[PDB]
Paper text:
In that population, activating mutations in the epidermal growth factor receptor (EGFR), a receptor tyrosine kinase, are a major cause of non-small cell lung cancer (NSCLC). In contrast to ATP-competitive inhibitors, these bind in a pocket adjacent to the ATP site, not the ATP binding site itself, and inhibit the kinase by stabilizing its inactive “C-helix out” conformation. The V948R mutation in the kinase C-lobe aids in crystallization of the inactive conformation of the kinase, which is required for allosteric inhibitor binding. Crystal structures of several simultaneously bound allosteric and ATP site inhibitor combinations revealed conformational changes, most notably in the phosphate-binding loop (P-loop), that may contribute to productive variations in cooperative binding.
To further explore the structural basis of cooperative binding of orthosteric and allosteric inhibitors, we determined co-crystal structures with mavelertinib+JBJ-125 and naquotinib+JBJ-063. A similar conformation is observed in the co-structure with naquotinib and JBJ-063, in which a folded P-loop conformation positions the side chain of F723 against the phenyl ring of the allosteric inhibitor. Finally, the repositioning of F723 with synergistic inhibitor pairs also constricts the exit tunnel to the allosteric site, which may enhance the affinity of JBJ-125 and JBJ-063. Overall, our structures show that cooperative combinations of ATP-competitive and allosteric inhibitors assume the same putative cooperative conformation driven by a π-stacking interaction between F723 and the phenyl ring of the extended allosteric inhibitors, whereas other combinations either sterically clash or induce a conformation that disfavors co-binding. In all co-structures with cooperative inhibitor combinations, the P-loop folds downward into the space typically occupied by the phosphates of the ATP and positions the side chain of F723 against the phenyl ring in the allosteric inhibitor. This rearrangement provides apparently favorable hydrophobic contacts and π-stacking between this phenylalanine residue and the allosteric inhibitor. Pre-binding with osimertinib, AZ5104, mavelertinib, or naquotinib increased the binding affinity of the allosteric inhibitor. We observe synergistic inhibition and cooperative binding with a subset of third-generation irreversible inhibitors, including mavelertinib and naquotinib in addition to osimertinib. Here, we identify the 3rd-generation TKIs mavelertinib and naquotinib as also being capable of cooperative binding and synergistic inhibition, demonstrating that this mechanism is not limited to osimertinib.
Residue numbers in the entry: 702 to 860, 876 to 985, 996 to 1006
Write the structure that this text describes.
């Protein structure tokens, strides 16, 4: 009952937020039949052709992605299956952290960057308890609800991010909770470099070759060595040598209580009912 099957006549698409090869994402509003409320939602219309055989496969995975309950993980709210499947989730008025961190390059402090690292690790730690592998962790897949509250989305999507995958994922298609730790390190690198592109100048056809010869992402200018060594431990060849999500929460939470020691940032020195693009 956590996944609600909506009728096509009870939600509206207003504006597209972006498109691609897996579907178009819209901004919209949801009014359940009877209830007298408006709910801002995001609607992702797929390109997958529906059918009694395919509809059963889509629905069964949509029930597990509606059963997550963590402050830093996004929950799937509803599905509409007609001649085209439409997925409905809550609208995150601030967008994704890649675009956010890139647009506020010159005004993000050490407290926000480290707190984002703790919040993302908590959401990935909960997914581990629920035995769900994300498989595509990146700064583009972290949504911002408020500047002090982020949530991870689009998990369990293997129903290609070569530069975010662990080495065992590139070579043998192995996706585990420890390969997610690798993707977490790259995501942290994105935040600490204010949205830079990883391995800039290297083709994706060479990423597997370049990692085994000993290459890693460089040390971000604002990070001390203590922050960088955590990120590098996420990129070890031996999967069981990478840190756990439990340990990452603890170590990054210790650094958040004295943020200026661990991040050198230029000019570094309740939230109830807040929006940004829910208007214009
Ligand atoms: C990270 C971006 C990205 O990859 N994509 C692909 C499609 C979209 O994916 C979404 N989007 C949303 N909702 C959403 C997207 C974008 C925004 N805006 C905010 C405002 C805009 N400006 C920033 C500041 N300037 C000054 C004025 C406004 C930047 C982008 C807002 C909401 C959602 C959702 N609500 O769940 N999900 C996805 C797919 C997971 C963008
Ligand atoms: C070719 N033949 C066709 C059918 C088979 C198939 C099986 C399952 C799916 C399926 C099911 C469910 C989802 C997804 C995909 C998915 O992409 N989903 C996201 C999500 O919707 N995001 C959003 N953005 C903005 C608005 S909705 C998502 C949202 C969320 F809130 C939490 C987690 C999550 O993964 C959910 C598709 C096709 C494959 C073989």
């Amino acid at each position: 009952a956590l996944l609600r099957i909506l009728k096509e006549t009870e939600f509206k698409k207003i504006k597209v937020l972006g498109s691609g090869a897996f579907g178009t994402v819209y901004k919209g509003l949801w009014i359940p039949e009877g209830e007298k409320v408006k709910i801002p939602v995001a609607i992702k219309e797929l390109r997958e052709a529906t059918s009694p055989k395919a509809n059963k496969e889509i629905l069964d995975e949509a029930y597990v992605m509606a059963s997550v309950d963590n402050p830093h993980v996004c929950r799937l709210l509803g599905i509409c299956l007609t001649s085209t499947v439409q997925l409905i989730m809550q609208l995150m008025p601030f967008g994704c952290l890649l675009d956010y961190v890139r647009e506020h390059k010159d005004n993000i402090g050490s407290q926000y960057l480290l707190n984002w690292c703790v919040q993302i690790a908590k959401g990935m730690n909960y997914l581990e308890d629920r035995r769900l592998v994300h498989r595509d962790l990146a700064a583009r897949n972290v949504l911002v609800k408020t500047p002090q509250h982020v949530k991870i989305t689009d998990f369990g999507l293997a129903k290609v991010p070569i530069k975010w995958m662990a080495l065992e994922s590139i070579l043998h298609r192995i996706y585990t909770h420890q390969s997610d730790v690798w993707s977490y390190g790259v995501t942290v690198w994105e935040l600490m470099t204010f949205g830079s592109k990883p391995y800039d100048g290297i083709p994706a056809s060479e990423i597997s070759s370049i990692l085994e010869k000993g290459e890693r992402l460089p040390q971000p200018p604002i990070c001390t060595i203590d922050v960088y060594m955590i990120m590098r431990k996420c990129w070890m060849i031996d999967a069981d040598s990478r840190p756990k999500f439990r340990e990452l929460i603890i170590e990054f939470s210790k650094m958040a209580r004295d943020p200026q020691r661990y991040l050198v940032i230029q000019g570094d020195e309740n939230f109830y009912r807040a929006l940004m693009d829910e208007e214009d």
